[PDB]
């Protein structure tokens, strides 16, 4: 596969049903055996789609109640580099509940990156 086709396909399919977002990245950095957080924001036009049929898990104890579902995927172009990690997180305030990028599958062709396929939780 020529890379330009992959780029054109991702840009098109994003433009079929785009949504503007403001992904806010909170990167933990180790400092003296503890974390120091640096909050940053980035904006990307991105398509959101269903990728699984799953049930909404509900967690409720003395810390607080929150319910999350792990169905929505995400597809974002190459315009911005994303990294989600045990120490780094990416979220954005979509209406109908906060979204959180659990995992990022990078669409690479011949060692050149041309978009990310991505998975979300809709933390209600």
């Amino acid at each position: 596969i020529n890379i330009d086709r992959r780029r054109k396909d991702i840009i098109r399919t994003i433009n079929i049903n785009p949504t503007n977002i403001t992904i806010t990245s909170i990167k933990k950095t180790e400092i003296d055996g503890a974390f120091e957080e640096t909050e940053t924001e980035i904006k990307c036009v991105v398509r959101i789609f269903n990728e699984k049929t799953a049930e909404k898990q509900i967690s409720s104890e003395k810390q607080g109640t929150f319910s999350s579902i792990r169905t929505y995927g995400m597809l974002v172009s190459n315009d911005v580099i994303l990294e989600v990690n045990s120490r780094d997180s990416l979220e954005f305030e979509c209406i109908y509940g906060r979204m959180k990028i659990v995992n990022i599958y990078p669409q690479i062709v011949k060692g050149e990156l041309c978009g990310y396929q991505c998975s979300l939780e809709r933390i209600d």
């Binding site: 396909d9 098109r12 399919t13 789609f49 269903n50 990728e51 699984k52 049929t53 995927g73």
Partner: protein, 103 residues
Amino acid sequence: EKLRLLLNDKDKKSFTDEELNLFLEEADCIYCAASQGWILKSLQYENTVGEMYEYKVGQETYKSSSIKDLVSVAYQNADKFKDMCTNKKEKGSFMLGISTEFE
């Protein structure tokens, strides 16, 4: 208005008025202009549907008619307008006299 009738006779929003007036002055009858414009419209499908005519994303699936069907309908429209023009110009058979000269 002849330009208005042409923009009705094919799709409306996809062309600027200059090239439609160019078609109108190319051929007398407006149906020929509509046929040629429909072929020109049919040219567009190499991008829209040729590049992708059905794609699936996650659980979402989308399918559209292939480029062959779209250009088939476009050419069918153009050919129908061509036939309409020819029939408008068509006239039936005739039977005429001959007149030589002799002395």
